Design a protein around this ligand. Structure first.
Ligand SMILES: [NH3+]C1CCCCC1
Ligand SMILES: [Ca+2]
Ligand SMILES: [Cl-]
Ligand SMILES: [Cl-]
Lengths: 250, 58
């Protein structure tokens, strides 16, 4: 995260850290006790799918305070329409091997109904994006969880204001064109969370951009509202052998 | 009422029905109050609420 602030410990309790062989891979979002939403592109280069760990209740990577909960990832579900190395349909649904225990430091973000998300949440201007990604373009990653309030743009306005992949209907722009404030490398997969009448909802996933905090350009986020029914169906499905599962979309 | 305007007055989710009818709903871990619009938590750790801040204003 570029130009944000430390998320006070416990105030981003749905934030997930994904690790491969102990190394920072990506962010994610807890949406109930066994399911995590992340970005499909996080898994493009995975060799051993069985070395993937999800961590909840994380805050300061330099220490262990006992609020952390680590789980093996039993399933990574990616839509059929996602093509590795590209940007469209950038979403993954992860099944944890064992549920996390909900605590003051570990709480799911609400996955909204589509209609509610399209009719109401899509018009809430500002939303929060978070992660342990790079603090600057070509900079070091954060040891403390960072968070940034970013405004959403209508796609026509994003294209108008920007100055190379299209912004499809499965994406949206948010942030700033003055190169001060953005999500960055290592934040991918993390939440774009939207507050409405006292409660927070998942509206976006940190996905891509033209570099980080590049003047003339905005962050691009996966438009989660397009995937609600796809996710809800999968969460009702039985686990299948083998970690990676490609599932038809729609 | 209608769900496209003002969220139909609902705190959370909204369904339009045949006639001048609307039903509000709440996410799992919440229940709808008798006003027909408000949602109140039914569990300790409902989705989308931040315990340390909820305690801070409780
Ligand atoms: N704003 C995006 C920049 C590239 C990494 C993912 C976040
Ligand atoms: Ca820690
Ligand atoms: Cl099934
Ligand atoms: Cl496997």
């Amino acid at each position: 995260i570029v130009g944000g602030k430390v998320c006070p410990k416990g105030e981003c309790p749905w934030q997930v850290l994904l690790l491969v062989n102990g190394a920072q891979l990506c962010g994610g979002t807890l949406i109930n006790t066994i399911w995590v939403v992340s970005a499909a592109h996080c898994f493009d280069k995975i060799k051993n799918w069985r070395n993937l760990i999800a961590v909840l209740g994380e805050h300061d990577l330099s220490e262990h305070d006992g609020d952390e909960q680590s789980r093996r990832v039993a399933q990574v579900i990616i839509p059929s329409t996602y093509v590795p190395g590209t940007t469209n349909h950038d979403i993954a649904l992860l099944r944890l091997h064992q549920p996390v225990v909900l605590t003051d430091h570990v709480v799911p973000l609400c996955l909204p109904e589509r209609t509610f998300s399209e009719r109401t949440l899509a018009f809430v201007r500002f939303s929060l994006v978070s992660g342990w990604g790079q603090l600057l373009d070509r900079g070091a990653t954060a040891l403390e969880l960072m968070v940034l309030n970013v405004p959403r743009l209508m796609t026509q306005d994003c294209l108008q204001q920007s100055r190379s992949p299209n912004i499809t209907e499965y994406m949206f722009c948010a942030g700033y064109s003055d190169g001060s404030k953005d999500s960055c490398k290592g934040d991918s997969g993390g939440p774009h969370a939207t507050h409405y009448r006292g409660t927070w909802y998942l509206t976006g996933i940190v996905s891509w951009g033209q570099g980080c905090a590049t003047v003339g350009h905005f962050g691009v986020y996966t438009r989660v509202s397009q995937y609600i029914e796809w996710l809800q169906k999968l969460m009702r499905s039985e686990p299948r052998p083998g970690v990676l599962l490609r599932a038809p979309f729609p | 009422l209608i769900c496209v305007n003002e969220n139909g007055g609902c705190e959370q989710y909204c369904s339009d029905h045949t006639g001048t009818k609307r039903s509000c709903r709440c996410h799992e871990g919440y229940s709808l109050l008798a006003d027909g619009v408000s949602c109140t938590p039914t569990v300790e750790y409902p989705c989308g609420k931040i315990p340390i801040l909820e305690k801070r204003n409780a």
